[PDB]
């Protein structure tokens, strides 16, 4: 029964850049796999890393 008011199919569920799904490649800060580099561990992140110093 006719056709129109739609067509743009695509379905872009596969990033061109990283390959991984969920985002488009325009918005690809594809993961750089390192937890805390500042020490080396991957328990924590530099934005948190002061080792520890209480309140």
Closest to Zn ion by CB, 7 vs 10, is: 10
Alpha-carbon distances, residue 37 vs 9, 29, 31, 46, 50 (angstroms): 42, 18, 14, 7, 13
Backbone φ and ψ of 7, nearest 5°? -175, -35
* Site pattern 2..31 for Zn ion (x: CB under 5 A): -------------x-xx---------x-x-
Q: Is 35 in the site for Zn ion (CB under 5 A)?
A: no
Between residues 7 and 32, which has the closer beta carbon with respect to Zn ion? 32
C-alpha span between 19 and 13 (Å, rounded): 10
Residues that bind Zn ion (CB under 5 A): 15, 17-18, 28, 30, 36, 38-39, 49
């Amino acid at each position: 029964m006719q056709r129109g008011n739609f067509r743009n199919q695509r379905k872009i569920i596969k990033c061109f850049n990283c390959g991984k799904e969920g985002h488009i490649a325009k918005n690809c800060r594809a993961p750089r796999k390192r937890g805390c580099w500042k020490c080396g561990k991957e328990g924590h992140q530099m934005k948190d890393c002061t080792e520890r110093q209480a309140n």
